[PDB]
């Protein structure tokens, strides 16, 4: 399998039938190198992808302290760990980055140069040799059709020169094209080894710097974070049990407590207080003639009544303080509704309690809170 | 300045769930809002941790496929002895490496991606479940208080009144109950949050220690000193290339130093260097070929004499050709189609010979004389 260039001009057909074995193996080589090129760019891809994915974790771990909650801010210890685990991934990004750089120059770059320069140069010298050959082959046919009797010598001669110009062209392109294919035999052997040596090398660095960074000494901090997590689980667990019991006790209450009444005069009713607050319904002339009865929480402070609707904090613009008077009143045929009245007596507000117990207690608690006129 | 404080963790008191004061329900709203931004974040983060698992699980395939191609070199037909022996080695390194990335990917998913998924899909999901459920029972209770409020003061129906009171017992119970369950959940979540933020990342660090520790041994200085012998094995090719490369450039120069009289068949008939005494040719000639009773054609074809036989073999043929002879023939120049330098090898019958065509007359004569010299080989 020499493909010896020194023979020749005017190629034997046996020379050709070897040259075709070169052309053959070349073709199947270029095919395979594409199949291998892709595979190596796919590992490089995944390498670069690893760099971005880590790079994203840094951002997101740090983003915790940037997210704004209603509680759990300045988590300090939790912030500290997330910040540490971030600094880790940051340095891991550089190891996968350095490996990415490596695979792109010592592994992938070789194969591209081979495919783009070597295998390429061959496939082009081939084409030039092929064309060069055909040009000759045809000039030969022309030269053969020259007539024997009678010709002009000067014509015969010129056609011969044409044949020769072509023959030497074929010689030139064929010598080049052969040297090309022989050299390729050595180039491939290196082009298949070197790329994979580069791979192995870049990885030594990846596992060297890396295993150093992920030492047993780092492992001492990890174990202490785990103990912090363990100390939370115990808190949680006992706290869950505290709540589990607390819940059961509050749910063991009998049905009479969820039912509105109760019974008239059965539970005593403190007649002299100021403290009282709770839900009631408030009449509200929504439109002329129409009314709505909205449940809202009422409570008392500095001689004033307040209204805090459910949900929101604070609020409660209600008429007091002044000399008002409260008394039970009938309204829209409703039960346990009562009404206060401004000093004027105009636009008196009217509310409703559910219990009777509660009804009389509110009323007792408002005509006696307004006693303080001094 | 700032002075030390007695610590605190945030809780809904539970005892004030039956009461359901609006001031309790205000703290509940902030609790929800906290849970809100949290679910937003754990989503945002989970996405990120699934992408590193992505890049990992993909790397597992990327290596898996690489070796399969390193191992496909030995499956193509060729004319690479030590090349195969290394590609197997470098394959072992890749299949072995793959195993590590696979062992990582696995642990990555079980010890890091898992604790967040479960967190978002069981713990955070339970909150929303109990919230929608809680607010529902509260909505029910509100509409229940309505009916009770509409009941007439006179004339009161002692049967209707007792029926609606019982309706208020339930739904109020339902609210109280769902509220205790919803609160207890949110309180517990304050603790789950912390654990499920720092714990997920621990497992990932552990996988990455075992990954680098198991992989640092693997990629040792033994491998390093071996790679050196392969670098040497590559140099020993670069030198043999440069050697045979220089040799070829020289040979190429020499073969082209020839002057144009060689490339030309034009070379004068006058003064032809004819070797009339040989036993082997050697050349391309054109072969007259009948292509119908009238029409004919001439094809360039190699020709070589062998065991008394004239052979053919067209260019690009596997081999050939066995066209005429071995035994008795007579060859002579011929005038055929006004072509120049044709000659006919006649069969022993004394009729019907093949007609060939040479290029230079130097060639024609040499072919003729040669054939005749073969025709006397006894």
């Amino acid at each position: 399998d020499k493909l010896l260039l020194e023979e020749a001009l005017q190629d034997s057909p046996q020379t050709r039938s070897l040259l075709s074995v070169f052309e053959e193996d070349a073709g199947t080589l270029t095919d395979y190198t594409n199949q291998l090129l892709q595979a190596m760019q796919r590992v490089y891809g995944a390498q670069n992808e690893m760099c971005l994915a880590t790079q994203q974790l840094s951002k997101q771990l740090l983003a915790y302290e940037k997210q704004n909650f209603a509680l759990g801010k300045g988590d300090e210890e939790v912030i500290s760990t997330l910040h540490y685990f971030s600094k880790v991934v940051d340095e891991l990004n550089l190891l996968h980055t350095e490996l990415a750089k490596q695979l792109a120059d010592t592994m992938v770059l070789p194969i591209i140069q081979f495919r783009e320069k070597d295998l390429t140069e061959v496939s082009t010298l081939k084409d030039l040799f092929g064309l060069a050959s055909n040009e000759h082959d045809l000039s030969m046919a022309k030269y053969s059709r020259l007539p024997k009797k009678k010709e002009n010598e000067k014509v015969k001669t010129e056609v011969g020169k044409e044949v020769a110009a072509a023959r030497r062209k074929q010689h030139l392109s064929s010598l080049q094209y052969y040297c090309a294919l022989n050299a390729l035999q050595y180039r491939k052997q290196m082009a298949m080894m070197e790329p994979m040596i580069g791979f192995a090398h870049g990885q030594i660095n990846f596992f060297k710097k890396g295993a150093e960074m992920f030492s047993k000494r780092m492992d001492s901090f990890l174990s202490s974070v785990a103990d912090m997590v363990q100390s939370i689980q115990v808190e949680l667990e006992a706290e869950a049990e505290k709540m589990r019991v607390s819940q059961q006790e509050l749910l063991s209450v009998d049905e009479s407590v969820y039912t509105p009444d109760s019974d008239v005069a059965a539970p005593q009713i403190n007649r002299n207080l100021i403290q009282k607050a709770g839900y009631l319904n408030l009449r509200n002339k929504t439109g002329l003639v129409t009314t709505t009865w909205e449940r809202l929480y009422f409570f008392t402070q500095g001689g004033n009544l307040m209204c805090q609707p459910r949900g929101a904090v604070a609020g409660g613009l209600i008429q007091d303080l002044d000399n008002c008077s409260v008394m039970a009143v009938d309204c829209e045929d409703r039960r346990y509704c009562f009404q206060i009245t401004t000093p004027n007596g105009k636009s008196g507000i009217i509310l409703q309690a559910e219990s009777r117990k509660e009804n009389e207690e509110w009323i007792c608690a408002i005509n006696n809170i307004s006693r303080q006129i001094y």
Side-chain angles (χ1 to χ4, degrees), chain A:
Chain A
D1 60 338
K2 196 103 169 165
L3 202 295
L4 186 267
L5 70 87
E6 299 176 333
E7 279 197 328
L9 192 272
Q10 44 205 33
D11 48 54
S12 59
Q14 182 173 9
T15 277
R16 281 292 189 82
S17 57
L18 169 63
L19 177 62
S20 82
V21 173
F22 274 74
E23 282 173 346
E24 171 73 24
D25 292 343
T28 74
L29 184 64
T30 66
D31 280 341
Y32 165 95
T33 66
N34 295 342
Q35 297 294 341
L36 187 72
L37 180 282
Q38 286 190 12
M40 294 159 73
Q41 291 186 319
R42 176 162 189 261
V43 301
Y44 164 82
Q47 202 54 234
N48 195 41
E49 227 294 306
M50 248 306 295
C51 293
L52 307 189
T54 60
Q55 179 186 122
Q56 185 170 337
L57 268 181
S58 286
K59 184 159 264 68
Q60 269 301 303
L61 289 164
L62 300 166
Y64 190 105
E65 79 216 357
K66 308 211 204 84
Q67 290 305 302
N68 64 336
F69 308 37
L71 310 92
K73 283 189 146 182
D75 217 297
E76 281 298 309
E77 283 177 307
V78 167
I79 284 206
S80 301
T81 65
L82 259 70
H83 198 97
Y84 172 72
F85 280 93
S86 181
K87 200 76 171 185
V88 168
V89 172
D90 284 291
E91 299 179 38
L92 187 81
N93 163 277
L94 301 182
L95 298 184
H96 283 264
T97 285
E98 260 301 296
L99 183 56
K101 175 70 178 294
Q102 274 293 117
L103 301 177
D105 310 328
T106 79
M107 180 203 211
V108 167
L109 190 276
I111 297 294
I112 299 163
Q113 288 180 321
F114 188 69
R115 179 65 186 89
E116 290 295 317
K117 300 191 173 290
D118 296 337
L119 295 173
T120 281
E121 179 191 4
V122 172
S123 65
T124 52
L125 282 169
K126 171 178 195 162
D127 278 86
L128 295 184
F129 158 62
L131 296 168
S133 158
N134 277 269
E135 291 190 5
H136 175 241
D137 291 322
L138 273 85
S139 65
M140 195 69 71
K142 184 183 202 192
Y143 169 66
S144 299
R145 301 194 191 80
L146 279 172
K148 87 181 293 147
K149 289 301 174 223
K150 303 182 176 183
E151 25 76 290
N152 281 322
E153 295 167 17
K154 294 175 181 177
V155 177
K156 161 192 150 43
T157 296
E158 198 67 20
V159 177
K161 295 175 72 176
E162 178 189 318
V163 128
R167 202 178 298 188
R168 102 191 303 162
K169 176 178 178 163
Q170 183 171 341
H171 196 51
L172 192 141
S173 60
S174 58
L175 285 161
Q176 292 174 356
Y177 175 51
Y178 287 15
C179 295
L181 290 171
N182 296 296
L184 187 69
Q185 301 306 325
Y186 303 92
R187 292 291 284 102
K188 83 176 182 177
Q189 295 177 61
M190 305 183 297
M192 289 296 301
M193 296 166 62
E194 254 168 1
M196 226 45 41
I197 277 73
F199 172 85
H201 266 297
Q203 297 244 325
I204 262 73
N205 305 0
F206 176 78
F207 287 107
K208 182 187 181 297
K209 289 184 293 183
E212 284 178 1
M213 184 71 262
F214 288 56
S215 59
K216 301 171 187 176
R217 300 176 177 181
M218 159 182 295
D219 220 319
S220 85
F221 172 79
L222 300 184
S223 59
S224 64
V225 180
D227 281 285
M228 192 182 172
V229 176
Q230 179 60 28
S231 58
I232 294 164
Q233 181 59 13
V234 300
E235 258 283 317
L236 194 165
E237 200 67 19
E239 190 67 25
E241 183 66 47
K242 176 182 170 179
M243 286 184 293
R244 177 152 38 242
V245 175
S246 297
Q247 165 170 315
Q248 181 178 2
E249 292 177 344
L250 300 174
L251 294 165
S252 76
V253 173
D254 57 40
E255 183 170 321
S256 89
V257 177
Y258 301 78
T259 48
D261 306 18
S262 210
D263 166 35
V264 1
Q268 288 184 344
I269 310 168
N270 176 285
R271 327 192 73 80
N272 298 276
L273 58 84
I274 294 94
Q275 174 183 359
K276 185 161 191 184
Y279 288 117
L280 298 173
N281 297 257
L282 163 57
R283 185 176 190 176
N284 182 25
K285 201 171 177 173
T286 61
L288 40 80
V289 198
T290 311
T291 65
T292 188
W293 295 86
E294 312 177 15
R295 274 257 300 192
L296 298 169
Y297 201 85
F298 294 95
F299 66 83
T300 51
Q301 288 179 350
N304 292 39
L305 189 66
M306 306 292 187
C307 196
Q308 166 156 19
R310 192 139 69 170
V313 185
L317 310 170
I318 288 181
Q319 292 176 342
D320 263 321
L321 58 84
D322 241 48
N323 281 340
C324 303
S325 62
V326 60
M327 67 172 291
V329 51
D330 285 18
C331 182
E332 303 178 11
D333 192 353
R334 279 196 167 199
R335 62 197 316 275
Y336 309 160
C337 28
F338 60 85
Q339 170 180 39
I340 73 178
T341 43
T342 63
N344 302 13
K346 300 185 166 181
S347 62
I349 297 168
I350 165 171
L351 305 170
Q352 173 187 16
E354 63 161 345
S355 279
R356 199 163 169 170
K357 198 282 188 179
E358 299 287 300
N359 176 269
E360 195 169 23
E361 195 161 62
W362 274 103
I363 298 153
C364 271
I366 303 152
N367 71 331
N368 90 321
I369 194 183
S370 199
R371 286 169 182 176
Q372 288 55 34
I373 178 57
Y374 57 77

mmCIF file of all heavy atoms in Angstrom, chain A residues 278-293:
data_model
loop_
_atom_site.group_PDB
_atom_site.id
_atom_site.type_symbol
_atom_site.label_atom_id
_atom_site.label_comp_id
_atom_site.label_asym_id
_atom_site.label_seq_id
_atom_site.Cartn_x
_atom_site.Cartn_y
_atom_site.Cartn_z
ATOM 1 N N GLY A 278 -66.744 43.035 69.034
ATOM 2 C CA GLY A 278 -67.187 41.830 68.353
ATOM 3 C C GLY A 278 -67.905 42.145 67.053
ATOM 4 O O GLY A 278 -68.105 43.311 66.718
ATOM 5 N N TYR A 279 -68.298 41.109 66.320
ATOM 6 C CA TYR A 279 -69.020 41.296 65.062
ATOM 7 C C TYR A 279 -70.473 41.729 65.276
ATOM 8 O O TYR A 279 -71.140 41.275 66.205
ATOM 9 C CB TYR A 279 -69.006 40.009 64.234
ATOM 10 C CG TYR A 279 -67.669 39.661 63.620
ATOM 11 C CD1 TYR A 279 -67.001 38.498 63.981
ATOM 12 C CD2 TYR A 279 -67.086 40.482 62.662
ATOM 13 C CE1 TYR A 279 -65.783 38.168 63.418
ATOM 14 C CE2 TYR A 279 -65.864 40.159 62.095
ATOM 15 C CZ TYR A 279 -65.219 39.001 62.477
ATOM 16 O OH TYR A 279 -64.005 38.671 61.918
ATOM 17 N N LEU A 280 -70.951 42.608 64.399
ATOM 18 C CA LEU A 280 -72.365 42.971 64.336
ATOM 19 C C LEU A 280 -72.723 43.331 62.902
ATOM 20 O O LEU A 280 -71.842 43.546 62.071
ATOM 21 C CB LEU A 280 -72.681 44.166 65.236
ATOM 22 C CG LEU A 280 -72.457 44.031 66.740
ATOM 23 C CD1 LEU A 280 -72.665 45.383 67.375
ATOM 24 C CD2 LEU A 280 -73.405 43.018 67.357
ATOM 25 N N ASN A 281 -74.018 43.407 62.620
ATOM 26 C CA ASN A 281 -74.488 43.804 61.304
ATOM 27 C C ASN A 281 -74.866 45.275 61.358
ATOM 28 O O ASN A 281 -75.434 45.725 62.352
ATOM 29 C CB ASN A 281 -75.696 42.970 60.884
ATOM 30 C CG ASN A 281 -75.369 41.494 60.737
ATOM 31 O OD1 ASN A 281 -75.215 40.993 59.624
ATOM 32 N ND2 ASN A 281 -75.272 40.789 61.860
ATOM 33 N N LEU A 282 -74.534 46.022 60.308
ATOM 34 C CA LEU A 282 -74.836 47.452 60.258
ATOM 35 C C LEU A 282 -75.774 47.815 59.117
ATOM 36 O O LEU A 282 -75.444 47.643 57.943
ATOM 37 C CB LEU A 282 -73.546 48.267 60.148
ATOM 38 C CG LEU A 282 -73.664 49.730 59.695
ATOM 39 C CD1 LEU A 282 -74.601 50.550 60.585
ATOM 40 C CD2 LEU A 282 -72.286 50.380 59.647
ATOM 41 N N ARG A 283 -76.946 48.325 59.482
ATOM 42 C CA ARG A 283 -77.874 48.884 58.518
ATOM 43 C C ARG A 283 -77.178 49.988 57.755
ATOM 44 O O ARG A 283 -76.416 50.760 58.330
ATOM 45 C CB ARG A 283 -79.074 49.487 59.228
ATOM 46 C CG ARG A 283 -80.148 49.990 58.291
ATOM 47 C CD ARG A 283 -81.358 50.476 59.056
ATOM 48 N NE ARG A 283 -82.481 50.732 58.163
ATOM 49 C CZ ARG A 283 -83.700 51.087 58.559
ATOM 50 N NH1 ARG A 283 -83.984 51.236 59.847
ATOM 51 N NH2 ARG A 283 -84.647 51.295 57.660
ATOM 52 N N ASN A 284 -77.455 50.073 56.462
ATOM 53 C CA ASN A 284 -76.819 51.072 55.623
ATOM 54 C C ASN A 284 -77.691 51.403 54.422
ATOM 55 O O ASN A 284 -77.801 50.614 53.484
ATOM 56 C CB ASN A 284 -75.446 50.574 55.170
ATOM 57 C CG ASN A 284 -74.711 51.584 54.322
ATOM 58 O OD1 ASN A 284 -74.950 52.789 54.423
ATOM 59 N ND2 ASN A 284 -73.809 51.101 53.475
ATOM 60 N N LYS A 285 -78.321 52.572 54.466
ATOM 61 C CA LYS A 285 -79.164 53.029 53.374
ATOM 62 C C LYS A 285 -78.313 53.121 52.101
ATOM 63 O O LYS A 285 -77.718 54.158 51.810
ATOM 64 C CB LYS A 285 -79.808 54.377 53.738
ATOM 65 C CG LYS A 285 -81.068 54.715 52.946
ATOM 66 C CD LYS A 285 -81.785 55.949 53.509
ATOM 67 C CE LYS A 285 -83.004 56.324 52.670
ATOM 68 N NZ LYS A 285 -83.828 57.414 53.264
ATOM 69 N N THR A 286 -78.247 52.012 51.361
ATOM 70 C CA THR A 286 -77.415 51.913 50.162
ATOM 71 C C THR A 286 -77.942 52.823 49.063
ATOM 72 O O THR A 286 -77.187 53.544 48.409
ATOM 73 C CB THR A 286 -77.408 50.485 49.587
ATOM 74 O OG1 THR A 286 -78.742 50.106 49.225
ATOM 75 C CG2 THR A 286 -76.855 49.487 50.584
ATOM 76 N N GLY A 287 -79.248 52.752 48.849
ATOM 77 C CA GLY A 287 -79.941 53.641 47.938
ATOM 78 C C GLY A 287 -81.195 54.080 48.652
ATOM 79 O O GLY A 287 -81.511 53.534 49.711
ATOM 80 N N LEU A 288 -81.892 55.076 48.113
ATOM 81 C CA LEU A 288 -83.176 55.467 48.684
ATOM 82 C C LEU A 288 -84.031 54.219 48.879
ATOM 83 O O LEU A 288 -84.124 53.377 47.993
ATOM 84 C CB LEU A 288 -83.898 56.521 47.830
ATOM 85 C CG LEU A 288 -83.909 56.468 46.296
ATOM 86 C CD1 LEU A 288 -84.920 55.484 45.736
ATOM 87 C CD2 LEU A 288 -84.185 57.858 45.750
ATOM 88 N N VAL A 289 -84.605 54.078 50.070
ATOM 89 C CA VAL A 289 -85.399 52.900 50.448
ATOM 90 C C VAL A 289 -84.605 51.594 50.657
ATOM 91 O O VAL A 289 -84.867 50.872 51.616
ATOM 92 C CB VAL A 289 -86.559 52.625 49.457
ATOM 93 C CG1 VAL A 289 -87.586 51.717 50.110
ATOM 94 C CG2 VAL A 289 -87.234 53.920 49.027
ATOM 95 N N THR A 290 -83.665 51.273 49.773
ATOM 96 C CA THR A 290 -82.915 50.026 49.892
ATOM 97 C C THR A 290 -82.001 50.051 51.110
ATOM 98 O O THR A 290 -81.619 51.123 51.585
ATOM 99 C CB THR A 290 -82.059 49.778 48.635
ATOM 100 O OG1 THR A 290 -82.866 49.956 47.465
ATOM 101 C CG2 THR A 290 -81.472 48.376 48.632
ATOM 102 N N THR A 291 -81.667 48.866 51.619
ATOM 103 C CA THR A 291 -80.700 48.722 52.708
ATOM 104 C C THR A 291 -79.820 47.491 52.508
ATOM 105 O O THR A 291 -80.220 46.526 51.859
ATOM 106 C CB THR A 291 -81.395 48.567 54.076
ATOM 107 O OG1 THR A 291 -82.128 47.337 54.105
ATOM 108 C CG2 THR A 291 -82.340 49.723 54.342
ATOM 109 N N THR A 292 -78.617 47.541 53.071
ATOM 110 C CA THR A 292 -77.767 46.364 53.195
ATOM 111 C C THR A 292 -77.368 46.201 54.655
ATOM 112 O O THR A 292 -77.217 47.185 55.379
ATOM 113 C CB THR A 292 -76.492 46.462 52.327
ATOM 114 O OG1 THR A 292 -75.807 45.204 52.345
ATOM 115 C CG2 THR A 292 -75.548 47.554 52.833
ATOM 116 N N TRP A 293 -77.203 44.953 55.082
ATOM 117 C CA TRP A 293 -76.781 44.651 56.444
ATOM 118 C C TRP A 293 -75.431 43.951 56.422
ATOM 119 O O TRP A 293 -75.358 42.729 56.294
ATOM 120 C CB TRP A 293 -77.810 43.767 57.140
ATOM 121 C CG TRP A 293 -79.137 44.433 57.349
ATOM 122 C CD1 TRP A 293 -80.177 44.489 56.466
ATOM 123 C CD2 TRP A 293 -79.569 45.133 58.520
ATOM 124 N NE1 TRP A 293 -81.228 45.180 57.015
ATOM 125 C CE2 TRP A 293 -80.880 45.586 58.279
ATOM 126 C CE3 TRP A 293 -78.975 45.420 59.754
ATOM 127 C CZ2 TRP A 293 -81.608 46.313 59.218
ATOM 128 C CZ3 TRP A 293 -79.699 46.140 60.688
ATOM 129 C CH2 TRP A 293 -81.001 46.577 60.415
#
